[PDB]
Amino acid sequence: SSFEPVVVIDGKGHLLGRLASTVAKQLLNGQKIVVVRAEALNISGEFFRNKLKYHDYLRKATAFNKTRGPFHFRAPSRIFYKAVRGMISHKTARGKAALERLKVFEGVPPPYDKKKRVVVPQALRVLRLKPGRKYTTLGKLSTSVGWKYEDVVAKLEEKRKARSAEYYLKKKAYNAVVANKSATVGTEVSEKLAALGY
Amino acid sequence: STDSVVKASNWRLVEVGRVVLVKQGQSAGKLATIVEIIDQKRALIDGPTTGVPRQAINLGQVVLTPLTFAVPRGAKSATVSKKWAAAGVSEKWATSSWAKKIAQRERRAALSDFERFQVLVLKKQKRYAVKKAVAK
Amino acid sequence: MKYIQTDQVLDVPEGVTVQIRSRIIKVTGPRGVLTKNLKHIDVTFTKVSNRQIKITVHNGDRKHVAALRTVKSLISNLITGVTKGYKYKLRYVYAHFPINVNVIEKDGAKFIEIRNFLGDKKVREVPVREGVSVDFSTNQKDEIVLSGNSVENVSQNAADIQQICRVRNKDIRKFLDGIYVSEKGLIEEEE
Amino acid sequence: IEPSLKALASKYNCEKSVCRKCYARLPPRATNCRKRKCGHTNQLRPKKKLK
Amino acid sequence: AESHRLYVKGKHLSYQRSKSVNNPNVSLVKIEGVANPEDAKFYLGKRVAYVYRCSKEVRGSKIRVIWGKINRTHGNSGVVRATFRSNLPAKTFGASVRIFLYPSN
Amino acid sequence: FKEYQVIGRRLPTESVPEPKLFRMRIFAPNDVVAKSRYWYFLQKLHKVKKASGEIVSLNVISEAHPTTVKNFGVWVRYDSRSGTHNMYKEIRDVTRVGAVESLYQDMAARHRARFRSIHILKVVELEKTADVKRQYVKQFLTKDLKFPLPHRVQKSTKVFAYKRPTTFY
Ligand SMILES: [Zn+2]
Numbered sequence A: 001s002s003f004e005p006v007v008v009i010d011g012k013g014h015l016l017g018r019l020a021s022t023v024a025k026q027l028l029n030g031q032k033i034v035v036v037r038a039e040a041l042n043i044s045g046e047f048f049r050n051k052l053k054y055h056d057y058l059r060k061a062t063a064f065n066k067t068r069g070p071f072h073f074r075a076p077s078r079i080f081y082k083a084v085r086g087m088i089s090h091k092t093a094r095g096k097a098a099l100e101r102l103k104v105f106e107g108v109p110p111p112y113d114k115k116k117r118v119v120v121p122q123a124l125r126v127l128r129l130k131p132g133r134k135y136t137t138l139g140k141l142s143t144s145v146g147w148k149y150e151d152v153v154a155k156l157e158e159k160r161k162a163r164s165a166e167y168y169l170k171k172k173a174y175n176a177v178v179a180n181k182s183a184t185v186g187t188e189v190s191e192k193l194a195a196l197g198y
Numbered sequence B: 001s002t003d004s005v006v007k008a009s010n011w012r013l014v015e016v017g018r019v020v021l022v023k024q025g026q027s028a029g030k031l032a033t034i035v036e037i038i039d040q041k042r043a044l045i046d047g048p049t050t051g052v053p054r055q056a057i058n059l060g061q062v063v064l065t066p067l068t069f070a071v072p073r074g075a076k077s078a079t080v081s082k083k084w085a086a087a088g089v090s091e092k093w094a095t096s097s098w099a100k101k102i103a104q105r106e107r108r109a110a111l112s113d114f115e116r117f118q119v120l121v122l123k124k125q126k127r128y129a130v131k132k133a134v135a136k
Numbered sequence C: 001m002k003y004i005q006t007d008q009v010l011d012v013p014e015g016v017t018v019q020i021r022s023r024i025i026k027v028t029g030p031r032g033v034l035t036k037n038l039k040h041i042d043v044t045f046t047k048v049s050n051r052q053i054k055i056t057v058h059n060g061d062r063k064h065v066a067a068l069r070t071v072k073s074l075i076s077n078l079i080t081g082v083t084k085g086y087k088y089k090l091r092y093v094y095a096h097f098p099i100n101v102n103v104i105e106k107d108g109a110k111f112i113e114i115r116n117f118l119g120d121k122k123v124r125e126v127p128v129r130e131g132v133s134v135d136f137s138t139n140q141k142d143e144i145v146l147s148g149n150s151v152e153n154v155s156q157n158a159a160d161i162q163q164i165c166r167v168r169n170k171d172i173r174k175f176l177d178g179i180y181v182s183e184k185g186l187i188e189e190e191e
Numbered sequence D: 001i002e003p004s005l006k007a008l009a010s011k012y013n014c015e016k017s018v019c020r021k022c023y024a025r026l027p028p029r030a031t032n033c034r035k036r037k038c039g040h041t042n043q044l045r046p047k048k049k050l051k
Numbered sequence E: 001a002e003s004h005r006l007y008v009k010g011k012h013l014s015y016q017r018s019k020s021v022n023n024p025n026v027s028l029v030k031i032e033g034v035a036n037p038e039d040a041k042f043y044l045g046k047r048v049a050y051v052y053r054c055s056k057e058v059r060g061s062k063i064r065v066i067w068g069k070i071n072r073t074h075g076n077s078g079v080v081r082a083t084f085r086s087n088l089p090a091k092t093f094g095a096s097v098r099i100f101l102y103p104s105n
Numbered sequence F: 001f002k003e004y005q006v007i008g009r010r011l012p013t014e015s016v017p018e019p020k021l022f023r024m025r026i027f028a029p030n031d032v033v034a035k036s037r038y039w040y041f042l043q044k045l046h047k048v049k050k051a052s053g054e055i056v057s058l059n060v061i062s063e064a065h066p067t068t069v070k071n072f073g074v075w076v077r078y079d080s081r082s083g084t085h086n087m088y089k090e091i092r093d094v095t096r097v098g099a100v101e102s103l104y105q106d107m108a109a110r111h112r113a114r115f116r117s118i119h120i121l122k123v124v125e126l127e128k129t130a131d132v133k134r135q136y137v138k139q140f141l142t143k144d145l146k147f148p149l150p151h152r153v154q155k156s157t158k159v160f161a162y163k164r165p166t167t168f169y
Helices: A076-082 A092-103 A143-147 A156-166 A170-178 A189-194 B077-087 B090-094 B097-110 B113-135 C063-085 C152-166 D003-011 E035-043 F031-042 F096-111
Strands: A033-036 A103-104 B018-022 B031-037 B042-047 B051-057 B064-067 C005-010 C018-019 C026-028 C043-046 C053-058 C086-093 C100-104 C111-115 C126-127 C132-136 C143-148 C178-185 D017-019 D044-046 E006-016 E024-031 E048-053 E063-066 E072-076 E079-083 E095-099 F003-010 F022-028 F055-061 F070-079 F087-093 F117-126
Touching: A076 A103, A076 A143, A076 B064, A092 A103, A156 B051, A189 B113, B018 B042, B031 B051, B031 B064, B031 B090, B042 B077, B051 D017, B090 B097, B113 C086, C005 C063, C018 C063, C026 C063, C053 C063, C063 C152, C086 C152, C086 D003, C111 C152, C126 C152, C132 C152, C143 C152, C152 C178, C178 D003, E006 E079, E024 E095, E035 E072, F003 F031, F003 F096, F022 F031, F022 F096, F022 F117, F031 F055, F070 F096, F087 F096, F096 F117
Parallel strands: A033 A103
Antiparallel strands: B018 B031, B018 B064, B031 B042, B042 B051, C005 C053, C018 C026, C043 C053, C086 C143, C086 C178, C100 C111, C111 C126, C132 C143, D017 D044, E006 E024, E006 E095, E024 E079, E048 E063, E048 E095, E072 E079, F003 F022, F003 F055, F070 F087, F070 F117
C-alpha cells in the first residue's frame, strides 16, 4: 500500500488471474506496473486442461473473416495481459488509460533488470495452490500454442541471471565488509543511544 | 562419505508445551502454551502469566514460537503457570531476536517527534564514523 | 480422513549411501549412482540409523498418503538397483520367422534394431536408454537380456522392445510372434 | 512354438479380462476398468481364447 | 530538506455507486498506508485538496485547487468517502489528492 | 449456539391439573428458537401443541468444564432427499455446544444436510478411549502427539511485498 511511480512485478511464481486481478485493480487506481517474467506465470490447472481451455479460444473466431475475430495471442506475455484487458472496463477511455499503464514482458527486458521487482503475495503459487494441486506454467502452455520464443528466452535469461548473480557478490562483499565496522562503531555512545531511541 | 546424509527438515511442532504467540483477538501478541490439542487446526491455549485466558483457538489465529517447555497434556492454568516459571519461558522468549524485533517496532511507534528527530542526529553521527571507517 | 501423520521406513543397506536434500535422491552404492527428483510429491525424509529413513507425510489425504508409499518403493528400487542391479530376460517368441535382433550402434547411442520380424521387410529400431546395458544370453538361444542400475530405465527399455514387436491387424492369439519378458529380476546372484 | 513361450505370450495377450462397455483390454484379476470413458466400470469379461 | 510534504498522499478512486448508477457528490479516496477503518478514522475531517494545473493564469497562478474533506470511512479497506466543495471530475480517477493533517487533533 | 434446557407442561385441564412436565436439552441459538425446537420435538412425541400447552422454563445450560478437550459422541437423525437416516458421529470439541455447532457444519458439508433436516438425538461425552470408534477422532488420542503445520502462509496486509515469501515453520 504505497503509491510508487512505476512498480515492477516479477511475474515469476504468481498464479495468473490472481496476480492479474490485481495488476488490474492497480491500474484503475492510477498505479502503474510492468509485469516481467511472465513466461513463468503459473495457472492452477494441470497442464493438459489449461491447454484444452486454450484450444477453446484458439477456435473462436469471426466466422466471416477470421481476421477481425478475437485475436488469440500466444505470447506468454499477452496470455496474461488479456486476463486483464479482460478484468477492466477497457472500452471507456479510463480503460485504455489503464491498459496503457501496464507493460508486460517475459524474461526481463532492460529498463528493469536493474530495478527491484516485487511479488504480489496474494497470488504466488506457493501460498495458494494447496500443495499437490497440479499447476502449469504459461511459459509452456504458450509454447504449446505458437509462441516462437521460449528457447530464445531461456537464453537471454541465464545470460541475465548470471550478471544479476555476479552482481550479488559485489553486493555481499561490499556489505559483510560494511558490517565489520557497524561493530567497531557499535557499543559507542552514539549507539547505547539510538539503541534506545529504538 | 560413507554417512548417508538427509537434510533434514526442521520444524516447529504444535505439541504440548509449544509456546505460541497469539496473532489476533483479545490476547493479541501474547505468549501462551498449547496445552491439550484438539485437531489439525484447533488447539487449546493458556498463558495465565501473560494474561491470555484459557481457550480453544484456531492455530491460524496463533503462531508457534521456537520455544518449548515441560507440560503434561491437559494441564490447567495453575499447573501451567508453575511449570512456566520453572522453565523460565518468558525470559527465554524476551532474549529471542523475534521478541526483540517485536518490542523494537513498538518502541519505534512510541517515539515522540522530538525523540524521533534525535534519531536523525544520532543516525547521522553513526554514518560519519562508519563512512570514515569504510575508507580505512 | 486426512490422516495426521503416516510413515514408511526405508532400510538402507550397509554398502550404499543416500544423499537427500529437498526432494532429490542421490543413492550411491557398489554398482554406481542413481538420482531422482521426487519434487512432484511433498513428503518429508528423515535420517535415523544411517541404515534407516523415516519417509513421512503430515496431514495427507487418501491420495497423498498413497503417494508416500510409492515414494518409499521408488527409492527402495534405487537402493536395490545401485547394489543388485536389474536384469530383464526378454525372449524371442516366434512361430515361423525368426526375429534376428542386434545391438547396432548409430552415433554411439546403441539401438536394438529388430529385423525379419514376422517377415516384415521393415527394420524396427528401438533406442537403448542411458545406463542400460544390452546382452545376448549365452546358452539360452533367442533371448535378450537388458540389465542396468535404474529399473525405471531398464524395464521401460525392455518394454519399448516388447511394444515395437506388436502384431497389427492379425489376431494376436494366433500370432504370438513377439519379444516378451520372461523374468524381471536383479543382476547379483545368490539373491 | 514350444509351450513355455506360448504360455509366455498368452500371458501377455489372452490371459486378460476385457471391459464390456469400453472393450478395453484389462488385467485378469481386475475388478474395475481403468478407462474413465466407461465410468470405471465393473462390467468385465474374459478375453476369449483361440479355438 | 528534500522532503516538504505535510499532507498525506491520496488516490482518488471513484464516485460512490451501485452496480450501475453513480453519485458524483461523494468521492472515494484511497489513503497511503491505510489498511483498515480503525486506521482510517484518523483521517475523518482532515481536509483534502485535489490540486491540478491548467493552461491559464487565472489569478496569478496557472494552477488550481478543489478543496474538500473526508466525511467517513468506506468499507473495511481504508477507503474514505470525501465530499469535495465541488465534485471531482472523473478525469481524476486514479488521481493524486492531498489529504492534509488539519482540522487536526 | 447455546444448549437451552426447555421444560414444558401442556396446560391444566379441569379434572387433570398438575401435568407430567417434559424436558429437552435443545441446542438452539436463542430463547425463541429453543421454544420452537422444544415444541417441534414435543409435537413428534406427544399430543400437545404450543397452543394447547405451555413452556415452563428456559434455562441455558453451560458446559461444566469448558476448557477440556472431550470426545463427544452424537447420534443424528438426518433427512436426505431420498430417505431419513440415523448416524453416529464423534466430535473432539471443548463443549457440547461447540460440538453440536460443528456437527451441523459437518453434516452440511458431508451430506448437504441443513440444520432443519438434522435432529440431535443424543450427545455424549465418551469417558473411555476405545468407546471412540471413529478413526478420525482416534488420531488425536495417541500417547505423545506431536505434529508440524507444514506450509505456513502469511496474510500480508499490503498488496505487494519485496522479500519473496516463505512457508518455513
Ligand atoms: Zn471399460
